[PDB]
Write a protein that binds this ligand. Structure first.
Ligand code: KU5
Ligand code: MN
Ligand code: MN
Length: 180
């Protein structure tokens, strides 16, 4: 039972992102052939995390997302024993060596405001920095400190809106939007 959205995902994102997304879904027990909207969302989040880590200086960001659970926890252990940063309750997506904080990247189809709240009660880890992006182009970050400069965030926002368009021209957006 192969969907249009599954085939759109595979052509839309690059093969390394797709395969990491597949690994992640199967690891948590989900099927990208069936949970296709989730498939699309994991790839999007992954790509955003990668573009984010690319926006800084060379060795600025450690990438936690996209790794298998054990190795992701391993590097945060090491980050924590190297920095004395508090061990987060849940896996963050990045670590910032310049500002010395873990980052949780959010990608939402609803209001920046609502999702940001859900993400802060969900972690309660006072330490980790939160950065939300939406498919319509808005962002909110902890303490209004958006970490990267403006052109890097704008690149991410542009790609998000392109994903939205390519979906909509395939009549796939409405189903994707009401899935979250
Ligand atoms: O990394 C995430 N989850 C795994 C690490 S975690 O469980 O420690 C955790 C959990 C929650 C937050 C950070 C960390 C992560 N999850 C999500 C969304 C909303 C929260 C749960 N959720 C899921 O999709 C769970 S299912 C799943 C998870 C990962 C891959 C595939 C599937 Cl199917 N939103 C994010 O922005 C985000 O980064
Ligand atoms: Mn994550
Ligand atoms: Mn995230």
């Amino acid at each position: 039972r192969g969907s249009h959205m599954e085939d759109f995902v595979r052509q839309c994102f690059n093969p390394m992102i797709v395969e990491l997304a597949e690994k992640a879904m199967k690891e948590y027990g989900e099927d990208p052939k069936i949970e296709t909207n989730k498939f699309a969302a994991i790839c999007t989040h992954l790509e955003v995390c990668f573009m984010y880590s690319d926006g800084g200086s060379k060795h600025r960001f450690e990438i936690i997302e996209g790794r298998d659970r054990i190795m992701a926890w391993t590097v945060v252990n090491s980050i924590c024993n190297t920095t004395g940063v508090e061990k987060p309750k849940f896996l963050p997506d990045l670590y910032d060596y310049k500002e010395n904080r873990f980052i949780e990247i959010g990608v939402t189809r609803r209001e920046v405001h609502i999702y940001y709240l859900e993400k802060a009660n969900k972690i309660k880890s006072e330490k980790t920095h939160i950065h939300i992006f939406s498919f319509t182009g808005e962002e909110m970050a902890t303490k209004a400190d958006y970490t990267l400069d403006e052109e890097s965030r704008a690149r991410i926002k542009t790609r998000l809106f392109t994903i939205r368009q390519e979906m909509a021209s395939r009549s796939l957006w409405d189903s994707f939007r009401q899935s979250e």
